[PDB]
Amino acid sequence: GNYNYLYRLFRKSNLKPFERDISTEIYQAGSTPCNGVKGFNCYFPLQSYG
Amino acid sequence: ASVYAWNRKRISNCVADYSVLYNSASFSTFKCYGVSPTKLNDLCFTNVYA
Numbered sequence: 001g002n003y004n005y006l007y008r009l010f011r012k013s014n015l016k017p018f019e020r021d022i023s024t025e026i027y028q029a030g031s032t033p034c035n036g037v038k039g040f041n042c043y044f045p046l047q048s049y050g
Numbered sequence: 051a052s053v054y055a056w057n058r059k060r061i062s063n064c065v066a067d068y069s070v071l072y073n074s075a076s077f078s079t080f081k082c083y084g085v086s087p088t089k090l091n092d093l094c095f096t097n098v099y100a
Contacts, residue, residue, distance in 0.1 A: 012056060029087075031073045 003048035010045045063078035067091075 010027040028034045030041030040043070051057040068090040074091070085093065 017051075032075065 001050060003050070006046045006048050008045050009047045010043060059100040061100060062096070066098070 008021060010029070011021065012027070015021065024046070026034050026036055026038065027043055027045045028041070029043050032041050034042035068087075071077075072087060072090070080087070
């Protein structure tokens with residue numbers, strides 16, 4: 001399993017041309033706030049390929 | 051119902067407010083495989099089978 005390559009599955013907006021996103025901040029998937037800690041409806045934006 | 055005799059409930063001729071269901075935290079698994087949960091309240095479909 002080569003999981004070293006990751007992609008930005010979740011983001012709050014589409015990217016402008018020639019824009020790079022390198023901020024490893026938590027994503028809020030629901031109305032419940034996450035406050036920077038993982039939990040229910042708090043999924044990490046970056047996921048690894050299997 | 052049972053798994054071998056699952057009841058198929060058809061949802062049509064109504065407006066579905068997926069926000070209330072999506073914001074309920076009692077569902078321990080809310081996984082989608084063909085669409086986007088954040089786009090459910092805008093897209094349109096012919097009918098829904100449960």
